Amino acid sequence: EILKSDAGTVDFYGQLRTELKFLEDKDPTIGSGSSRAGVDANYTVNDSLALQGKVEFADMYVRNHILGVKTNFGKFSFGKQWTTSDDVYGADYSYFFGGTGLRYGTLSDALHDSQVKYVYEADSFWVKAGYGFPEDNAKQELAELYVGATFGDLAVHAGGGQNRDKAFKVGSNTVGTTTTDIKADVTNSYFEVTGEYTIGDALIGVTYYNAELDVENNPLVIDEDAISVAGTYKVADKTKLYAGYEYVMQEANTGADEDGTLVYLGVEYKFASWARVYAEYGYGDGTTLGYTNKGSDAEVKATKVDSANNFGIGARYYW
């Protein structure tokens, strides 16, 4: 982390991972993928009024590009960032496969680029919010607002946001010999409520998430209604169990009724505060319109699947 300081520290940090996923009916895959490293700064001036320059890397691309102003009340950060709703997330405690209950990232990779984010804290009660300038307009229209609080053991948060790409690629279709693509103007209209109950060794999360997508010049409705339950039991001091049950159902305005279930189950040994393994088993079934697993950053395309088993092992090295 820290390097030179006086009124402002200069973080340098990162996480070497190595992840082995074993999705159904494919080869085992490996990789340092999701590994990252970056450098953050800080510098106070008057009162409570300071900055931070966080910049991340991960084939060295750029996951964050923050140029942020701590203020006399809140904080305002401008640059490439995770969506606010990805920071807030919900009840996925999984390292590999969960996150299907959470319907903000149906379009936007959880990762808009010309974004600006307002965080204000005080108390337990926090208020986070985010806006995206669609510079070009090919970039999505994005706006998010989120509240939260905590009352002893119960840590509650609600919020939502809307998300619209002008030309969201879906996929192809072939007219025998003429491959047209399917690229439409579509809008993710999401709202969520979550609770997290912390009781000694235990944790229990439930997250309610509603979403809706629809196209400009088109008669079309899809009502994502979602739920997640999950929790962590701390079975040793170093070890930790986790599992979770996610369920989303999708009502078409044109009759069609589909859904899909995910059960994860796994474990996380924490050797030290820079080492940890984690082994995970996802069972699934049914449709998703695509999601993002925050933990592994494993950003999954819209898809329909069978009763299938998937395993995940991987370790990390922090600095």
Q: How far apart are CA 220 and CA 237, in angstroms?
A: 51
Domain boundaries, the chain: 1-319
Q: What letter does residue 88 receive in the DSSP assignment?
A: H
Q: Are 266 and 280 in contact (CB under 8 A)?
A: yes
Q: How far apart are CA 118 and CA 79, in angstroms?
A: 12
Structure tokens at 194: 């979550």
Torsion of Cα atoms, 95 then 97 then 101 then 102, to 10°: 60
Q: How was this structure determined?
A: X-ray
State the maximum Cα–Cα separation within the chain, in Å, rounded to a whole number: 68
Bridge partners of 22, per DSSP, are 311
Q: Which residues pair with 244 in a beta bridge?
A: 230, 264
3-state secondary structure of 316: strand
CA separation for the pair 177, 191 (Å, rounded): 42
- Between the two ends of the chain, the Cα-to-Cα distance in Å is 7
Q: Which residues contact 246 (CB under 8 A, 6 or more apart)?
A: 92, 98, 99, 100, 101, 226, 227, 228, 229, 230, 261, 262, 263
Residue type, 184: A
Phi-psi region of 159 (alpha: psi -120 to 50; beta: other; left: phi over 0): left
Which 8-state DSSP code applies to residue 254? S
Instruction: Tell the burial category of 77 from Cβ atoms under 10 Å away from its Cβ (0-12, 13-18, 19+).
Output: buried
Name residue 295's amino acid: G
Q: Which residue in 198, 194, 203 sits closest to 268, CA to CA?
A: 203
